[PDB]
Design a protein around this motif. Structure first.
Motif, short mmCIF file in Angstrom:
data_model
loop_
_atom_site.label_atom_id
_atom_site.label_comp_id
_atom_site.label_asym_id
_atom_site.label_seq_id
_atom_site.Cartn_x
_atom_site.Cartn_y
_atom_site.Cartn_z
N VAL D 12 0.84 -1.19 0.00
CA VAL D 12 0.00 0.00 0.00
C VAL D 12 0.88 1.25 0.00
O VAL D 12 0.60 2.20 -0.73
CB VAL D 12 -0.98 0.00 1.21
N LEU D 113 -6.50 0.64 -5.23
CA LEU D 113 -5.82 0.87 -3.95
C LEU D 113 -6.68 0.34 -2.81
O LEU D 113 -6.17 -0.30 -1.89
CB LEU D 113 -5.58 2.36 -3.74
N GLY D 117 -5.56 -2.39 -0.15
CA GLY D 117 -5.58 -2.13 1.28
C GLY D 117 -6.59 -3.04 1.96
O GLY D 117 -6.39 -3.47 3.10
#
Ligand SMILES: [Cs+]
Ligand SMILES: [Cs+]
Ligand SMILES: [Cs+]
Ligand SMILES: [Cs+]
Ligand SMILES: [Cs+]
Lengths: 174, 174, 174, 174
Positions: D12, D113, D117
């Motif tokens: 991340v 993303l 995550g």
């Protein structure tokens, strides 16, 4: 679909249209609930308002959902709106119990939608429900449970007497 | 006769005159109600003021009627005002029902005049009754219906306790 | 007890119940018209707001009718709410036209009710319809007529540019 | 990993540094877009500002990410910023398609993303994206979709007249 649609599942789209019909329906029953208590032979101003306030809350919900639907590129599809389960709601505890029953049903539909959106990998949708719906439902249900416990504490033989005091001292003109 | 009289049947004239006598009788009976509940051995300020406000509401009534009588060119004609039906009015529920009867009687008379007015094709008299009387009655009677219901809810073995709670939490010495 | 009811016909009570249903339905369709123009592929904020406001109007319309029903001693009796006759409403001129017909059906239902109450010799019902409904419909239908006339005046071959100007200059995002 | 780093995946971390470069890149394209419409031979103040405003936003975007990067304990690693894809963006409808396409690319980077995550079991990052990014992109895309549609509606041949009316009545020099 539209020029804006992105990561919005066909299922969830149908799912929200379904939820808006559920909220429309919910709203309808609270409207009924409200005018029932405004009848000359029920006359419980306090509880009447309680339900009217809730009817507006439900309205805000489906309007919120419809707005969201358009933002994700989904297309709103309307259906008939079932009439409320009952036409006369007896006394306040009975009205409350029904109202809670309704809310739990509504909350479940919300949890279900979230689970689906979670599955179809829809982070914006889940976030949306958590922000404007989940905590709202939890709070309203808690509030209704509190009311229930209190109404029960005022049970018969001084039933009517307690129903009155509950509308005066808890629901209040306001 | 008068230089202004136009389209004002001599029937509605005698009828309005009769109606102002009715309203004078009502106002007088409300005066009786008010001071009965102001007695030391009744002492219910909230219901006493409730009725006193009604004596005012009736006084406004006959005054509004006499004012119109003259506007149309009719001539006032006063008669004796009979004393209220009772010297004592029992408890709040009793007094309210009596009031309820009185108001319904009054509403009938308003409706009778409006019928006479339509029979004599008197559009002004009719609009006059709808703007300052009909809805006023509908609302007052509806409110008394609520009080009567809420009172019956407070009835039972603890009726005395309920009568007090109603005078305090609903009528309120306000 | 509906001990308040006086001069309120059983058939008018039913007609008002039927009228609120017709208003619930109208509101519904305006809710539909409202979010259709909020679509990213329709994108006409001005007309979207125009209709959303009308749904509110019709809403206050039926809520006003229920409030009255209880005031007279009537009982609200809800039915299913039929979904809007359409899922998509095309272009402004099309929508406006649809709304106009909806308004006329409504006006007609109102006139029919007034006729019935008149026949049933119910002056309060009649005064009530004249006070909060009849003039509102006329003013609304006249407004709609005006828009129709203006939209038409903005007819093709540049009707697209015309439809944008109307929403900008007449409906206004306010 | 410093003294504060906790449950903050290296994946991340690299992801965000890459994302800020993307927003930095988006920012840059908007400056280019903003000044193109400021040209004396394009002269469309309304659209020029609409883009300089979007650049401002993208700046807030990467700044929010860098500020976040440090809060988690990650280190910012900057790279070269690719120049805008074009040097002249033609007409209003050409630019909007460009920006729309840009925003879609960005929104996909965000969703990616989030998935990463989410996969690395990072609740704080996920919440952070939902709160400050997802819904903003959804709103901006819906927005641009309305503009496109309204632009397409002001189609041709009067593309020139319609392009001026749009910049005046929708985008507004205000
Ligand atoms: Cs979440
Ligand atoms: Cs009339
Ligand atoms: Cs009137
Ligand atoms: Cs969240
Ligand atoms: Cs949040």
């Amino acid at each position: 679909s539209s020029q804006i649609r992105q990561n919005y599942s066909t299922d969830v789209e149908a799912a929200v249209n379904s939820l808006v019909n559920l909220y429309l329906q919910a709203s309808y029953t609270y409207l009924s609930l409200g005018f029932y208590f405004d009848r000359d032979d029920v006359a419980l101003e306090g509880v009447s308002h309680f339900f009217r306030e809730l009817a507006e809350e439900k309205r805000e919900g489906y309007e919120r959902l419809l707005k969201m639907q358009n933002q994700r590129g989904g297309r709103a599809l309307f259906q008939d709106i079932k009439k409320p389960a009952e036409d006369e709601w007896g006394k306040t505890p009975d009205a409350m119990k029904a109202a809670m029953a309704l809310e739990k049903k509504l909350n479940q539909a919300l949890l279900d939608l979230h689970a689906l959106g979670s599955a179809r990998t829809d982070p914006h949708l889940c976030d949306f429900l958590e922000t404007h719906f989940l905590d709202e439902e939890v709070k309203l249900i808690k509030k209704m449970g509190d009311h229930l416990t209190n109404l029960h504490r005022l049970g018969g033989p001084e039933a009517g007497l307690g129903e009155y005091l509950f509308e005066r001292l808890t629901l209040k003109h306001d």
